[PDB]
Amino acid sequence: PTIDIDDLKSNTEYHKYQSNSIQIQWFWRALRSFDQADRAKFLQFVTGTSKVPLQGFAALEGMNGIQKFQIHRDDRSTDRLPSAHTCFNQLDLPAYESFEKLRHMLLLAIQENSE
Amino acid sequence: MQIFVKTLTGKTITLEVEPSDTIENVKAKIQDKEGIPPDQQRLIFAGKQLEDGRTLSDYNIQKESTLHLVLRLRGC
Ligand SMILES: [Zn+2]
Ligand SMILES: [Zn+2]
Ligand SMILES: [Zn+2]
Ligand SMILES: [Zn+2]
Ligand SMILES: [Zn+2]
């Protein structure tokens, strides 16, 4: 319910994406449009928990210490769903063809729960 | 034969499967009707997960049985 998305964006690492990559702009644009409940669902999808550190996302953890959120480029298929590695706060994002497809697959990924 | 696949809290599809098929084949057909890659699939038949190496006969799946499909999108 308190997600300064500029703070998460300023503390996000990339590989092999760049900060100005089109799928990254679509990613932050789509994450901005989510409810606080959906942003919490994304935080749980990527990190396993929806809690936000008191010092912001710069102090994000992390199995053995501070591990910033990181988006990686999935070079396997544009028709596969996003995936996360939790242990390393990493989101696998394929090079989707449109913003609508990225937002749709992202919502479909984070709104699968109970497991 | 013919089985059904209920996906999460939504749609349900049909599949023409033989008892000798492996679970990887079932997930491949699910990919052919759904587009979900097999490596992102996991199948549940009343509690227990279904390993890719086993077959439908090993789990004693009768005709018109409903497998529950869950997405495998998170790991360590
Ligand atoms: Zn990965
Ligand atoms: Zn459209
Ligand atoms: Zn739409
Ligand atoms: Zn196929
Ligand atoms: Zn996997």
Coordinates of N, CA, C and O and ligand atoms in Angstrom, one line a residue:
Chain A
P1 N 0.8 -1.2 0.0 CA 0.0 0.0 0.0 C 0.8 1.3 0.0 O 0.3 2.4 -0.1
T2 N 2.2 1.1 0.1 CA 3.1 2.2 0.0 C 4.3 1.8 -0.8 O 5.3 1.3 -0.4
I3 N 4.1 2.1 -2.1 CA 5.1 1.7 -3.1 C 5.5 2.9 -3.9 O 4.9 3.3 -4.9
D4 N 6.5 3.6 -3.5 CA 7.1 4.7 -4.3 C 7.8 4.0 -5.5 O 8.9 3.6 -5.4
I5 N 7.0 3.9 -6.6 CA 7.5 3.2 -7.8 C 8.8 3.9 -8.4 O 9.6 3.2 -9.0
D6 N 8.9 5.2 -8.2 CA 10.2 5.8 -8.5 C 11.4 5.3 -7.7 O 12.5 5.2 -8.2
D7 N 11.1 4.9 -6.4 CA 12.1 4.4 -5.6 C 12.5 3.0 -6.0 O 13.7 2.6 -5.9
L8 N 11.5 2.2 -6.4 CA 11.9 0.8 -6.9 C 12.6 0.9 -8.2 O 13.4 0.1 -8.5
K9 N 12.2 1.9 -9.1 CA 12.8 2.0 -10.4 C 14.2 2.5 -10.3 O 15.1 2.1 -11.1
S10 N 14.5 3.4 -9.3 CA 15.8 3.9 -9.1 C 16.7 2.9 -8.4 O 17.9 3.2 -8.4
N11 N 16.2 1.8 -7.9 CA 17.0 0.8 -7.3 C 16.8 -0.6 -8.0 O 16.6 -1.6 -7.4
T12 N 16.7 -0.6 -9.3 CA 16.5 -1.7 -10.1 C 17.7 -1.9 -11.1 O 18.1 -1.0 -11.7
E13 N 18.3 -3.1 -11.1 CA 19.4 -3.5 -12.0 C 18.8 -4.3 -13.2 O 17.8 -4.9 -13.1
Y14 N 19.6 -4.3 -14.2 CA 19.2 -4.8 -15.5 C 20.3 -5.7 -16.1 O 21.5 -5.4 -15.9
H15 N 19.8 -6.7 -16.9 CA 20.7 -7.6 -17.6 C 19.8 -8.6 -18.4 O 19.2 -9.5 -17.7
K16 N 19.7 -8.6 -19.7 CA 20.6 -7.8 -20.5 C 19.8 -6.5 -21.0 O 20.3 -5.9 -21.9
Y17 N 18.7 -6.2 -20.4 CA 18.0 -5.0 -20.7 C 18.8 -3.8 -20.3 O 19.7 -3.8 -19.5
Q18 N 18.4 -2.7 -20.9 CA 18.8 -1.4 -20.5 C 17.7 -0.6 -19.8 O 16.5 -0.9 -20.0
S19 N 18.0 0.4 -19.0 CA 17.0 1.2 -18.4 C 16.0 1.8 -19.3 O 14.8 2.0 -19.0
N20 N 16.4 2.2 -20.5 CA 15.6 2.8 -21.6 C 15.1 1.8 -22.6 O 14.5 2.2 -23.6
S21 N 15.2 0.5 -22.3 CA 14.7 -0.5 -23.2 C 13.1 -0.4 -23.2 O 12.5 -0.1 -22.2
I22 N 12.6 -0.7 -24.4 CA 11.1 -0.5 -24.6 C 10.3 -1.4 -23.7 O 9.3 -1.0 -23.1
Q23 N 10.8 -2.6 -23.4 CA 10.1 -3.5 -22.5 C 10.2 -3.1 -21.1 O 9.4 -3.4 -20.2
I24 N 11.3 -2.3 -20.8 CA 11.4 -1.8 -19.4 C 10.5 -0.6 -19.2 O 9.8 -0.5 -18.1
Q25 N 10.4 0.3 -20.2 CA 9.4 1.4 -20.1 C 8.0 0.8 -20.0 O 7.2 1.3 -19.2
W26 N 7.7 -0.2 -20.8 CA 6.4 -0.8 -20.7 C 6.2 -1.5 -19.3 O 5.1 -1.5 -18.8
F27 N 7.3 -2.0 -18.8 CA 7.2 -2.7 -17.5 C 6.8 -1.7 -16.4 O 5.9 -1.9 -15.6
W28 N 7.6 -0.6 -16.3 CA 7.3 0.4 -15.2 C 5.9 1.1 -15.5 O 5.2 1.4 -14.5
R29 N 5.6 1.3 -16.8 CA 4.3 1.8 -17.1 C 3.1 0.9 -16.6 O 2.1 1.4 -16.1
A30 N 3.3 -0.4 -16.8 CA 2.3 -1.3 -16.4 C 2.2 -1.5 -14.9 O 1.2 -1.6 -14.3
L31 N 3.4 -1.5 -14.2 CA 3.4 -1.6 -12.8 C 2.9 -0.4 -12.1 O 2.3 -0.5 -11.0
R32 N 3.0 0.8 -12.8 CA 2.4 2.0 -12.2 C 0.9 1.9 -12.2 O 0.2 2.4 -11.3
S33 N 0.3 1.2 -13.2 CA -1.2 1.2 -13.3 C -1.8 0.1 -12.4 O -3.0 0.0 -12.4
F34 N -1.0 -0.6 -11.7 CA -1.6 -1.7 -10.8 C -2.1 -1.1 -9.5 O -1.6 -0.1 -9.0
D35 N -3.1 -1.8 -8.9 CA -3.5 -1.4 -7.6 C -2.4 -1.7 -6.5 O -1.4 -2.4 -6.8
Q36 N -2.6 -1.1 -5.3 CA -1.6 -1.5 -4.3 C -1.7 -3.0 -3.9 O -0.6 -3.5 -3.6
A37 N -2.9 -3.6 -4.0 CA -3.0 -5.0 -3.8 C -2.2 -5.8 -4.9 O -1.5 -6.8 -4.7
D38 N -2.3 -5.3 -6.2 CA -1.6 -5.9 -7.3 C -0.1 -5.7 -7.2 O 0.7 -6.6 -7.6
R39 N 0.3 -4.5 -6.8 CA 1.7 -4.3 -6.5 C 2.3 -5.2 -5.4 O 3.4 -5.6 -5.5
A40 N 1.5 -5.4 -4.4 CA 1.9 -6.4 -3.4 C 1.9 -7.8 -3.9 O 2.8 -8.6 -3.5
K41 N 1.0 -8.1 -4.8 CA 1.1 -9.4 -5.5 C 2.3 -9.6 -6.3 O 2.9 -10.7 -6.4
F42 N 2.8 -8.5 -7.0 CA 4.0 -8.5 -7.7 C 5.2 -8.6 -6.8 O 6.2 -9.4 -7.1
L43 N 5.2 -7.9 -5.7 CA 6.3 -8.0 -4.8 C 6.4 -9.4 -4.2 O 7.5 -9.9 -4.0
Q44 N 5.2 -10.0 -3.9 CA 5.3 -11.4 -3.4 C 5.7 -12.4 -4.5 O 6.3 -13.4 -4.3
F45 N 5.4 -12.1 -5.8 CA 5.7 -12.9 -6.9 C 7.3 -12.9 -7.1 O 7.9 -14.0 -7.4
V46 N 7.9 -11.8 -6.9 CA 9.3 -11.6 -7.2 C 10.2 -11.9 -6.0 O 11.2 -12.6 -6.2
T47 N 9.8 -11.5 -4.8 CA 10.6 -11.6 -3.6 C 10.1 -12.6 -2.6 O 10.7 -12.9 -1.6
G48 N 8.9 -13.2 -2.8 CA 8.3 -14.1 -1.9 C 7.6 -13.4 -0.7 O 6.9 -14.1 0.1
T49 N 7.7 -12.1 -0.6 CA 7.0 -11.3 0.5 C 6.6 -9.9 -0.1 O 7.2 -9.4 -1.0
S50 N 5.5 -9.4 0.5 CA 5.0 -8.1 0.1 C 5.5 -6.9 1.0 O 5.2 -5.8 0.7
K51 N 6.3 -7.2 2.0 CA 6.8 -6.2 2.9 C 7.9 -5.4 2.2 O 8.7 -5.8 1.4
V52 N 7.9 -4.1 2.5 CA 8.8 -3.1 2.0 C 9.8 -2.7 3.1 O 9.4 -2.5 4.2
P53 N 11.1 -2.7 2.8 CA 12.1 -2.3 3.9 C 11.9 -0.9 4.3 O 11.4 -0.1 3.6
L54 N 12.3 -0.6 5.6 CA 12.1 0.7 6.1 C 13.0 1.7 5.4 O 12.6 2.9 5.4
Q55 N 14.1 1.3 4.9 CA 15.0 2.2 4.2 C 14.8 2.3 2.7 O 15.6 2.8 2.0
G56 N 13.6 1.8 2.3 CA 13.3 1.8 0.9 C 13.8 0.5 0.2 O 14.2 -0.4 0.8
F57 N 13.7 0.5 -1.1 CA 14.1 -0.6 -1.9 C 15.6 -0.7 -2.1 O 16.1 -1.7 -2.7
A58 N 16.3 0.3 -1.6 CA 17.8 0.2 -1.7 C 18.3 -0.9 -0.7 O 19.4 -1.5 -0.9
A59 N 17.6 -1.1 0.4 CA 17.9 -2.1 1.4 C 17.1 -3.4 1.2 O 16.7 -4.0 2.1
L60 N 16.8 -3.8 -0.1 CA 16.0 -5.0 -0.3 C 16.8 -6.2 -0.2 O 18.0 -6.3 -0.6
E61 N 16.2 -7.2 0.4 CA 16.8 -8.5 0.7 C 15.9 -9.6 0.3 O 14.7 -9.5 0.3
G62 N 16.4 -10.8 -0.2 CA 17.8 -11.1 -0.2 C 18.1 -12.3 0.7 O 17.6 -12.3 1.9
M63 N 18.8 -13.2 0.2 CA 19.1 -14.5 1.0 C 20.2 -14.3 2.0 O 20.1 -14.7 3.2
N64 N 21.4 -13.8 1.6 CA 22.5 -13.6 2.4 C 22.8 -12.1 2.7 O 23.7 -11.8 3.5
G65 N 22.0 -11.2 2.2 CA 22.3 -9.8 2.4 C 21.4 -9.0 1.5 O 20.3 -9.4 1.1
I66 N 21.8 -7.7 1.3 CA 21.0 -6.8 0.4 C 21.1 -7.3 -1.0 O 22.2 -7.5 -1.6
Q67 N 19.9 -7.4 -1.7 CA 19.8 -7.8 -3.1 C 18.8 -7.0 -3.7 O 17.6 -7.2 -3.5
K68 N 19.2 -6.0 -4.5 CA 18.2 -5.1 -5.2 C 17.4 -5.9 -6.2 O 17.8 -6.9 -6.8
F69 N 16.2 -5.4 -6.5 CA 15.3 -5.9 -7.5 C 16.0 -5.8 -8.9 O 16.6 -4.8 -9.2
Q70 N 15.9 -6.9 -9.7 CA 16.6 -6.9 -11.0 C 15.7 -7.6 -12.0 O 15.0 -8.6 -11.7
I71 N 15.6 -7.0 -13.2 CA 14.8 -7.5 -14.3 C 15.8 -8.1 -15.3 O 16.7 -7.4 -15.7
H72 N 15.5 -9.3 -15.7 CA 16.4 -10.0 -16.7 C 15.6 -10.3 -18.0 O 14.4 -10.4 -17.9
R73 N 16.3 -10.4 -19.1 CA 15.6 -10.6 -20.4 C 15.6 -12.1 -20.7 O 16.6 -12.7 -20.8
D74 N 14.4 -12.6 -20.9 CA 14.2 -14.0 -21.2 C 14.2 -14.2 -22.7 O 13.3 -13.8 -23.4
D75 N 15.3 -14.7 -23.2 CA 15.5 -14.8 -24.6 C 15.2 -16.3 -25.1 O 16.0 -16.9 -25.8
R76 N 14.0 -16.7 -24.7 CA 13.6 -18.1 -25.0 C 12.3 -18.1 -25.9 O 12.3 -18.8 -26.9
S77 N 11.3 -17.3 -25.5 CA 10.1 -17.2 -26.3 C 9.3 -16.0 -25.8 O 9.2 -15.7 -24.7
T78 N 8.7 -15.3 -26.8 CA 7.8 -14.2 -26.5 C 6.5 -14.6 -26.1 O 5.6 -13.8 -25.7
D79 N 6.2 -15.9 -26.2 CA 4.9 -16.5 -25.9 C 4.8 -17.2 -24.5 O 3.9 -17.8 -24.2
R80 N 5.9 -17.1 -23.8 CA 6.0 -17.7 -22.4 C 5.7 -16.6 -21.4 O 5.8 -15.4 -21.6
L81 N 5.2 -17.1 -20.2 CA 4.9 -16.3 -19.1 C 6.1 -15.8 -18.3 O 7.2 -16.4 -18.4
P82 N 6.0 -14.7 -17.6 CA 7.1 -14.2 -16.8 C 7.4 -15.2 -15.7 O 6.4 -15.9 -15.2
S83 N 8.6 -15.2 -15.2 CA 9.0 -16.1 -14.1 C 9.9 -15.3 -13.1 O 10.5 -14.3 -13.5
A84 N 10.0 -15.8 -11.9 CA 10.8 -15.1 -10.9 C 11.7 -16.2 -10.2 O 11.4 -17.4 -10.2
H85 N 12.8 -15.7 -9.6 CA 13.7 -16.6 -8.9 C 13.8 -16.3 -7.4 O 14.6 -17.0 -6.7
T86 N 13.0 -15.4 -6.9 CA 12.8 -15.2 -5.5 C 14.1 -15.1 -4.6 O 14.4 -14.1 -4.0
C87 N 14.9 -16.2 -4.6 CA 16.1 -16.2 -3.9 C 17.0 -15.0 -4.3 O 17.6 -14.3 -3.4
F88 N 17.1 -14.7 -5.6 CA 17.6 -13.5 -6.1 C 16.4 -12.7 -6.6 O 15.7 -13.2 -7.5
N89 N 16.1 -11.5 -6.0 CA 14.9 -10.8 -6.4 C 14.9 -10.4 -7.8 O 15.0 -9.2 -8.2
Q90 N 14.7 -11.4 -8.7 CA 14.9 -11.3 -10.1 C 13.6 -11.7 -10.8 O 13.0 -12.7 -10.5
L91 N 13.2 -10.9 -11.8 CA 12.1 -11.2 -12.7 C 12.5 -11.5 -14.1 O 13.2 -10.7 -14.7
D92 N 12.2 -12.7 -14.6 CA 12.4 -13.0 -16.0 C 11.3 -12.5 -16.9 O 10.2 -12.9 -16.8
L93 N 11.7 -11.5 -17.7 CA 10.8 -10.9 -18.6 C 11.1 -11.1 -20.1 O 12.2 -10.7 -20.5
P94 N 10.3 -11.8 -20.8 CA 10.5 -12.0 -22.2 C 10.4 -10.7 -23.0 O 9.7 -9.7 -22.5
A95 N 10.9 -10.6 -24.2 CA 10.9 -9.4 -25.0 C 9.5 -9.4 -25.7 O 9.4 -9.7 -26.9
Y96 N 8.5 -9.0 -25.0 CA 7.1 -9.0 -25.5 C 7.0 -7.9 -26.6 O 7.7 -6.9 -26.6
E97 N 6.1 -8.2 -27.5 CA 5.9 -7.4 -28.7 C 5.2 -6.1 -28.4 O 5.4 -5.1 -29.2
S98 N 4.3 -6.0 -27.4 CA 3.5 -4.8 -27.2 C 3.4 -4.6 -25.7 O 3.6 -5.5 -24.9
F99 N 3.1 -3.4 -25.3 CA 2.8 -3.0 -23.9 C 1.6 -3.8 -23.4 O 1.6 -4.2 -22.2
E100 N 0.6 -3.9 -24.2 CA -0.6 -4.6 -23.8 C -0.3 -6.1 -23.5 O -0.9 -6.6 -22.5
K101 N 0.5 -6.7 -24.3 CA 0.9 -8.1 -24.0 C 1.7 -8.2 -22.7 O 1.5 -9.2 -22.0
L102 N 2.6 -7.3 -22.5 CA 3.4 -7.3 -21.3 C 2.6 -7.1 -20.1 O 2.8 -7.9 -19.1
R103 N 1.6 -6.2 -20.1 CA 0.8 -6.0 -18.9 C -0.2 -7.2 -18.7 O -0.4 -7.6 -17.6
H104 N -0.7 -7.8 -19.8 CA -1.5 -8.9 -19.7 C -0.8 -10.1 -19.1 O -1.3 -10.8 -18.2
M105 N 0.4 -10.4 -19.6 CA 1.1 -11.6 -19.1 C 1.6 -11.3 -17.6 O 1.7 -12.2 -16.8
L106 N 1.9 -10.0 -17.3 CA 2.4 -9.7 -16.0 C 1.2 -9.9 -15.0 O 1.4 -10.5 -13.9
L107 N 0.0 -9.4 -15.3 CA -1.1 -9.6 -14.5 C -1.5 -11.0 -14.3 O -1.8 -11.5 -13.2
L108 N -1.4 -11.8 -15.4 CA -1.7 -13.2 -15.4 C -0.7 -13.9 -14.5 O -1.0 -14.9 -13.8
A109 N 0.6 -13.5 -14.5 CA 1.6 -14.1 -13.6 C 1.4 -13.8 -12.2 O 1.4 -14.7 -11.3
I110 N 1.1 -12.5 -11.8 CA 1.0 -12.2 -10.4 C -0.3 -12.6 -9.8 O -0.4 -12.7 -8.6
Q111 N -1.4 -12.8 -10.6 CA -2.7 -13.1 -10.0 C -2.9 -14.6 -9.9 O -4.1 -15.0 -9.7
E112 N -1.9 -15.4 -10.1 CA -2.0 -16.8 -9.8 C -1.4 -17.0 -8.4 O -0.3 -16.8 -8.1
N113 N -2.3 -17.4 -7.4 CA -1.9 -17.5 -6.0 C -2.3 -18.8 -5.4 O -2.7 -19.8 -6.1
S114 N -2.3 -18.9 -4.1 CA -2.6 -20.1 -3.2 C -1.5 -21.1 -3.3 O -1.6 -22.1 -2.6
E115 N -0.4 -20.9 -4.1 CA 0.7 -21.9 -4.2 C 2.0 -21.2 -4.0 O 2.6 -20.7 -4.9
Chain B
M1 N -8.7 -42.6 -25.3 CA -9.4 -42.1 -24.2 C -9.6 -40.6 -24.3 O -9.4 -40.0 -25.4
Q2 N -10.1 -39.9 -23.2 CA -10.4 -38.5 -23.2 C -10.4 -38.0 -21.8 O -11.2 -38.5 -21.0
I3 N -9.6 -37.1 -21.5 CA -9.5 -36.5 -20.1 C -9.7 -35.0 -20.2 O -9.8 -34.4 -21.3
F4 N -9.9 -34.4 -19.1 CA -10.2 -32.9 -18.9 C -9.1 -32.3 -18.1 O -8.5 -32.9 -17.3
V5 N -8.8 -31.0 -18.4 CA -7.8 -30.3 -17.7 C -8.4 -29.0 -17.2 O -8.8 -28.1 -18.0
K6 N -8.6 -28.8 -15.9 CA -9.1 -27.6 -15.3 C -7.9 -26.7 -14.9 O -7.0 -27.2 -14.2
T7 N -7.8 -25.5 -15.4 CA -6.7 -24.6 -15.2 C -7.0 -23.6 -14.1 O -7.9 -22.8 -14.3
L8 N -6.4 -23.7 -13.0 CA -6.5 -22.8 -11.9 C -8.0 -22.7 -11.4 O -8.6 -23.7 -11.1
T9 N -8.5 -21.4 -11.5 CA -9.8 -21.1 -11.2 C -10.6 -20.7 -12.4 O -11.6 -19.9 -12.3
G10 N -10.2 -21.3 -13.6 CA -10.8 -20.8 -14.8 C -11.3 -22.0 -15.8 O -12.1 -22.8 -15.4
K11 N -10.8 -21.9 -17.0 CA -11.3 -22.7 -18.1 C -11.0 -24.2 -17.9 O -10.1 -24.6 -17.1
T12 N -11.6 -25.0 -18.7 CA -11.4 -26.5 -18.7 C -11.3 -26.9 -20.1 O -12.2 -26.6 -20.9
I13 N -10.3 -27.7 -20.5 CA -10.1 -28.2 -21.9 C -10.2 -29.7 -21.9 O -10.2 -30.4 -20.8
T14 N -10.3 -30.3 -23.1 CA -10.3 -31.7 -23.3 C -9.1 -32.2 -24.0 O -8.5 -31.4 -24.9
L15 N -8.7 -33.4 -23.8 CA -7.5 -34.0 -24.4 C -7.7 -35.4 -24.8 O -8.3 -36.2 -23.9
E16 N -7.3 -35.8 -26.0 CA -7.4 -37.2 -26.4 C -6.0 -37.8 -26.1 O -5.1 -37.6 -26.8
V17 N -6.0 -38.6 -25.0 CA -4.7 -39.2 -24.5 C -4.8 -40.7 -24.5 O -5.9 -41.2 -24.3
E18 N -3.7 -41.3 -24.6 CA -3.6 -42.8 -24.4 C -2.9 -43.1 -23.1 O -2.0 -42.3 -22.7
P19 N -3.2 -44.2 -22.5 CA -2.6 -44.5 -21.2 C -1.1 -44.6 -21.2 O -0.5 -44.4 -20.2
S20 N -0.5 -45.0 -22.4 CA 0.9 -45.2 -22.5 C 1.7 -43.8 -22.6 O 2.9 -43.8 -22.5
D21 N 0.9 -42.7 -22.9 CA 1.6 -41.4 -23.0 C 2.3 -41.0 -21.7 O 1.8 -41.4 -20.6
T22 N 3.3 -40.3 -21.8 CA 4.0 -39.7 -20.6 C 3.3 -38.3 -20.3 O 2.6 -37.7 -21.1
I23 N 3.6 -37.9 -19.1 CA 3.1 -36.6 -18.6 C 3.6 -35.5 -19.5 O 3.0 -34.4 -19.7
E24 N 4.9 -35.6 -20.0 CA 5.4 -34.6 -20.9 C 4.6 -34.5 -22.1 O 4.5 -33.4 -22.7
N25 N 4.0 -35.6 -22.6 CA 3.2 -35.5 -23.8 C 1.9 -34.8 -23.5 O 1.4 -34.0 -24.3
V26 N 1.3 -35.0 -22.3 CA 0.1 -34.3 -21.9 C 0.3 -32.8 -21.8 O -0.5 -32.0 -22.3
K27 N 1.5 -32.5 -21.2 CA 1.8 -31.0 -21.1 C 2.1 -30.5 -22.5 O 1.9 -29.3 -22.7
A28 N 2.6 -31.3 -23.4 CA 2.8 -30.8 -24.8 C 1.5 -30.5 -25.5 O 1.3 -29.5 -26.2
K29 N 0.5 -31.4 -25.3 CA -0.9 -31.2 -25.8 C -1.5 -29.9 -25.2 O -2.1 -29.1 -25.8
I30 N -1.3 -29.8 -23.8 CA -1.8 -28.6 -23.2 C -1.1 -27.3 -23.8 O -1.7 -26.3 -23.9
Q31 N 0.2 -27.4 -24.2 CA 0.8 -26.3 -24.9 C 0.1 -26.1 -26.3 O 0.0 -25.0 -26.7
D32 N -0.3 -27.2 -26.9 CA -0.9 -27.1 -28.2 C -2.3 -26.5 -28.2 O -2.7 -25.9 -29.2
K33 N -3.0 -26.6 -27.1 CA -4.3 -26.0 -26.9 C -4.3 -24.7 -26.1 O -5.3 -24.0 -26.1
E34 N -3.2 -24.4 -25.5 CA -3.2 -23.2 -24.5 C -2.0 -22.3 -24.8 O -2.1 -21.1 -24.5
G35 N -0.9 -22.8 -25.3 CA 0.3 -22.0 -25.5 C 1.2 -21.9 -24.3 O 2.3 -21.3 -24.5
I36 N 0.8 -22.5 -23.2 CA 1.7 -22.5 -22.0 C 2.8 -23.4 -22.2 O 2.6 -24.6 -22.5
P37 N 4.1 -23.0 -22.1 CA 5.2 -23.9 -22.3 C 5.2 -25.0 -21.2 O 4.7 -24.8 -20.1
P38 N 5.6 -26.2 -21.6 CA 5.6 -27.3 -20.6 C 6.4 -27.1 -19.4 O 6.0 -27.5 -18.3
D39 N 7.6 -26.5 -19.5 CA 8.4 -26.2 -18.4 C 7.8 -25.3 -17.4 O 8.2 -25.2 -16.2
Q40 N 6.7 -24.5 -17.8 CA 5.9 -23.7 -16.9 C 4.6 -24.3 -16.4 O 3.8 -23.7 -15.9
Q41 N 4.5 -25.6 -16.6 CA 3.3 -26.4 -16.2 C 3.6 -27.3 -15.1 O 4.7 -27.8 -15.0
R42 N 2.6 -27.6 -14.2 CA 2.6 -28.7 -13.3 C 1.2 -29.2 -13.2 O 0.3 -28.5 -13.1
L43 N 1.1 -30.6 -13.2 CA -0.2 -31.2 -13.2 C -0.4 -31.9 -11.9 O 0.5 -32.6 -11.3
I44 N -1.6 -31.8 -11.4 CA -2.0 -32.4 -10.1 C -3.2 -33.3 -10.3 O -4.2 -32.9 -10.9
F45 N -3.1 -34.5 -9.8 CA -4.2 -35.5 -9.8 C -4.6 -35.9 -8.4 O -4.0 -36.8 -7.9
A46 N -5.4 -35.0 -7.8 CA -5.9 -35.3 -6.4 C -4.7 -35.3 -5.4 O -4.4 -36.4 -4.8
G47 N -4.1 -34.2 -5.2 CA -3.1 -34.0 -4.2 C -1.7 -34.2 -4.7 O -0.9 -33.3 -4.4
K48 N -1.3 -35.2 -5.4 CA 0.0 -35.5 -5.7 C 0.4 -34.9 -7.1 O -0.5 -34.9 -8.0
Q49 N 1.6 -34.4 -7.2 CA 2.1 -33.8 -8.4 C 2.4 -35.0 -9.4 O 2.7 -36.1 -9.0
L50 N 2.4 -34.7 -10.7 CA 2.7 -35.7 -11.7 C 4.1 -35.4 -12.3 O 4.3 -34.3 -12.9
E51 N 5.0 -36.4 -12.2 CA 6.3 -36.3 -12.7 C 6.3 -36.4 -14.2 O 5.5 -37.2 -14.8
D52 N 7.2 -35.7 -14.9 CA 7.3 -35.8 -16.4 C 7.6 -37.2 -16.9 O 7.2 -37.5 -18.0
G53 N 8.4 -37.9 -16.1 CA 8.9 -39.2 -16.6 C 7.8 -40.3 -16.6 O 7.9 -41.3 -17.3
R54 N 6.9 -40.2 -15.7 CA 5.8 -41.2 -15.5 C 4.8 -41.1 -16.6 O 4.9 -40.3 -17.5
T55 N 3.8 -42.0 -16.6 CA 2.8 -42.1 -17.5 C 1.4 -41.9 -16.9 O 1.3 -41.9 -15.6
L56 N 0.4 -41.9 -17.7 CA -1.0 -41.8 -17.2 C -1.4 -43.1 -16.5 O -2.2 -43.0 -15.5
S57 N -1.0 -44.2 -17.0 CA -1.3 -45.5 -16.4 C -0.7 -45.6 -15.0 O -1.3 -46.2 -14.1
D58 N 0.5 -45.1 -14.7 CA 1.1 -45.2 -13.4 C 0.3 -44.5 -12.4 O 0.3 -45.0 -11.2
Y59 N -0.4 -43.5 -12.7 CA -1.3 -42.8 -11.8 C -2.7 -43.3 -11.8 O -3.5 -42.8 -11.1
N60 N -2.9 -44.3 -12.6 CA -4.3 -44.9 -12.7 C -5.3 -43.9 -13.1 O -6.3 -43.8 -12.3
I61 N -5.1 -43.2 -14.2 CA -6.0 -42.1 -14.6 C -7.1 -42.8 -15.5 O -6.8 -43.2 -16.6
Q62 N -8.3 -42.9 -15.0 CA -9.4 -43.4 -15.7 C -9.9 -42.4 -16.8 O -9.5 -41.2 -16.7
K63 N -10.8 -42.8 -17.7 CA -11.3 -41.9 -18.7 C -12.2 -40.8 -18.1 O -12.8 -41.1 -17.0
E64 N -12.2 -39.7 -18.7 CA -13.0 -38.5 -18.2 C -12.5 -38.1 -16.9 O -13.3 -37.6 -16.0
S65 N -11.2 -38.2 -16.6 CA -10.7 -37.7 -15.3 C -10.2 -36.2 -15.5 O -9.9 -35.8 -16.6
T66 N -10.3 -35.5 -14.4 CA -10.0 -34.0 -14.5 C -8.6 -33.8 -13.8 O -8.5 -33.9 -12.5
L67 N -7.6 -33.5 -14.5 CA -6.3 -33.0 -14.0 C -6.4 -31.5 -13.7 O -7.0 -30.8 -14.5
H68 N -5.7 -31.1 -12.7 CA -5.7 -29.7 -12.3 C -4.3 -29.1 -12.7 O -3.3 -29.5 -12.2
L69 N -4.3 -28.1 -13.6 CA -3.1 -27.5 -14.1 C -2.8 -26.3 -13.3 O -3.6 -25.4 -13.0
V70 N -1.5 -26.2 -12.8 CA -1.0 -25.1 -12.1 C 0.2 -24.6 -12.8 O 1.0 -25.3 -13.4
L71 N 0.4 -23.2 -12.8 CA 1.6 -22.6 -13.4 C 2.8 -22.7 -12.5 O 2.7 -22.5 -11.3
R72 N 4.0 -23.1 -13.1 CA 5.2 -23.2 -12.4 C 6.1 -22.0 -12.8 O 6.9 -22.1 -13.8
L73 N 5.9 -20.8 -12.2 CA 6.5 -19.6 -12.6 C 7.5 -19.0 -11.5 O 8.1 -18.0 -11.7
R74 N 7.7 -19.8 -10.4 CA 8.6 -19.3 -9.3 C 9.5 -20.4 -8.8 O 9.1 -21.6 -8.8
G75 N 10.7 -20.0 -8.5 CA 11.6 -21.0 -7.9 C 12.7 -20.2 -7.2 O 12.5 -19.0 -6.9
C76 N 13.8 -20.9 -6.9 CA 14.9 -20.3 -6.2 C 16.1 -20.0 -7.1 O 16.6 -18.9 -7.3
Ligands
ZN1 ZN 15.4 -17.5 -15.0
ZN2 ZN -5.5 -4.1 -28.2
ZN3 ZN -6.6 -5.2 -22.0
ZN4 ZN 3.7 -28.8 -29.5
ZN5 ZN 11.4 -23.8 -14.4

